């Protein structure tokens, strides 16, 4: 979730409210390639697959598409569609609606090539939902190296301080009956809490900052925040092997890619007690 600053600046400017030029690209010659009333069949396909791609069958369906055209035009356009959709989800839009709106616009495109949907590499933001992994994947191929943002609130963390023993170690260490600082960082397998987001981030480093306070003897309340250090998406497709499969990994290994920075801003407040 996380609202998003009032003045965030979408990467897919709305152009004319509703989809009209929003997604989809400049042309060449000549406005032909199939009759003029007809919807671009690449879009038709996307619309036929919307029930599947916007659900937990997404991966399976995509794998099948990749295999059928060898990561060709249909497959690329679908993948760029997932990013735009996932982005829109990050800006607060319902995913399936965004998806349709996107596909309908591609549908107005009169060419049949892999760039009939724009992938503007600017300001991308991962949503944390169903298509985030594909957005990050998208980005590694179409993003020309640009860093992008995956707000800490969208990762699905759910950090129990009490069972990270390095942290607790530090907490239990002589102190007054009041203040005392704690600022410690530590590795964390986003997989403890979310396997989707693990697909995109793997391990990250988190950081804990706050104080702790002691009562009667006694226990202690730490209240403070968690924050995250920027992670680096290694876009070499052999790192997605286990997730994407033999066929797709192989096809993707032909395609150029560039790793990029993922910034993870924000606070996750935390409060805890414990003892001895
Ligand atoms: Ca990582």
Residues 6+ apart with CB under 8 A from 61: 49, 52, 53
How far is the CA of 200 from the CAs of 168, 178, 239, in angstroms?
28, 40, 10
Q: Which helix (H) or strand (E) holds 232?
A: strand 231-233
Q: Which of 65, 92, 124 is the last residue of a domain?
A: 124
Q: Residue 222, Cα to own-chain centre: how many angstroms? A: 31
The Å distance, Cα 16 to ligand 1 centre, comes to 38
Q: What gap in Å lies between CA 38 and CA 2, rounded to an integer?
A: 40
Residues 134 and 245 in one domain: yes
Check which CATH number belongs to the domain holding 103 and give it: 1.10.150.880
User: Helix crossing, 95-107 with 73-90: angle to 10°?
Assistant: 140
Residues 105 and 177 in one domain: no
The total domain count for the chain is 2
Residues 196 and 268 in one domain: yes
The Å distance, Cα 14 to ligand 1 centre, comes to 33
Residues 109 and 240 in one domain: no
Establish whether 4 is an annotated binding residue: no
Do 210 and 223 contact (CB within 8 A), yes or no?
Answer: yes
Residues 232 and 196 in one domain: yes
> Which of 273, 276, 268 minimizes the C-alpha distance to 1?
268
The Å distance, Cα 243 to ligand 1 centre, comes to 15
The Å distance, Cα 189 to ligand 1 centre, comes to 8
Q: What backbone phi and psi angles, to 5 degrees, belong to 185?
A: -115, 165
- Domain enclosing residue 197, as ranges: 125-276
Q: What gap in Å lies between CA 261 and CA 149, rounded to an integer?
A: 8
Q: Residue 272, Cα to own-chain centre: how many angstroms? A: 29
Q: Which of 124, 159, 188 is the last residue of a domain?
A: 124
Residues 129 and 192 in one domain: yes
Residues 198 and 132 in one domain: yes
Residues 117 and 132 in one domain: no
The Å distance, Cα 240 to ligand 1 centre, comes to 12
Please state whether the peptide bond connecting residue 95 to the residue before it is cis, i.e. omega within 30 degrees of 0. no
Establish whether 64 is an annotated binding residue: no
Q: Which two tokens stand for residue 16?
A: 């004319």
CB atoms within 10 A of CB 80: 25
Name beta bridge partners: 227: 207
Experimental technique = X-ray
Residues 202 and 220 in one domain: yes
Residues 6+ apart with CB under 8 A from 118: 12, 23, 24, 25, 80
Residues 6+ apart with CB under 8 A from 33: 110, 111, 112
Q: Would you call 93 helix, strand, or coil by DSSP?
A: coil
Residues 146 and 115 in one domain: no
Residues 188 and 226 in one domain: yes
Q: Would you call 227 helix, strand, or coil by DSSP?
A: strand
Residues 107 and 213 in one domain: no
Query: What does the chain come to in residues?
Result: 276
Residue 187 class from Cβ within 10 Å (0-12 exposed, 13-18 middle, 19+ buried)?
exposed
Check which CATH number belongs to the domain holding 265 and give it: 3.30.450.400
The Å distance, Cα 152 to ligand 1 centre, comes to 14
Establish whether 213 is an annotated binding residue: yes
The Å distance, Cα 198 to ligand 1 centre, comes to 8
Q: Which of 90, 105, 124 is the last residue of a domain?
A: 124
């Amino acid at each position: 979730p996380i609202e998003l600053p009032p003045t965030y600046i979408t990467p897919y400017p709305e152009i004319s409210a509703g989809g009209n030029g929003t997604y989809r690209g400049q042309d060449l010659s000549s406005g032909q390639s199939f009759p003029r009333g007809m919807q671009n069949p690449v879009a038709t396909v996307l619309l036929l697959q919307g029930d599947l791609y916007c659900s937990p069958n997404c991966l399976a369906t995509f794998q099948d598409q990749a295999r059928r055209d060898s990561f060709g035009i249909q497959s690329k356009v679908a993948l760029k569609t997932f990013a735009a959709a996932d982005q829109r989800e990050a800006e607060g839009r319902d995913l399936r609606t965004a998806y349709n709106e996107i596909a309908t616009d591609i549908g107005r495109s009169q060419q049949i090539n892999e760039n009939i949907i724009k992938y503007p590499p600017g300001n991308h933001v991962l949503s944390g939902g169903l298509m985030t992994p594909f957005h990050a994947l998208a980005h590694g191929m179409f993003g020309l190296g640009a860093p992008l943002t995956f707000p800490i609130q969208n990762v699905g963390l759910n950090v129990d301080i009490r069972g990270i023993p390095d942290v607790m170690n530090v907490i239990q260490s002589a102190r007054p009956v009041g203040t005392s600082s704690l600022d410690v960082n530590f590795a964390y397998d986003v997989g403890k809490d979310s396997n989707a987001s693990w697909l995109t981030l793997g391990n990250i480093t988190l950081r804990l900052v706050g104080t702790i306070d002691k009562n009667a003897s006694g226990a202690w309340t730490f209240s403070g925040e968690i924050r995250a250090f920027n992670d680096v998406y290694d876009a070499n497709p052999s790192n997605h092997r286990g997730w994407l499969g033999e066929n797709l990994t192989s096809l993707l290994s032909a395609v150029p890619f560039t790793s990029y920075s993922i910034e993870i801003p924000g606070s996750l407040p935390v409060t805890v007690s414990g003892n001895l």
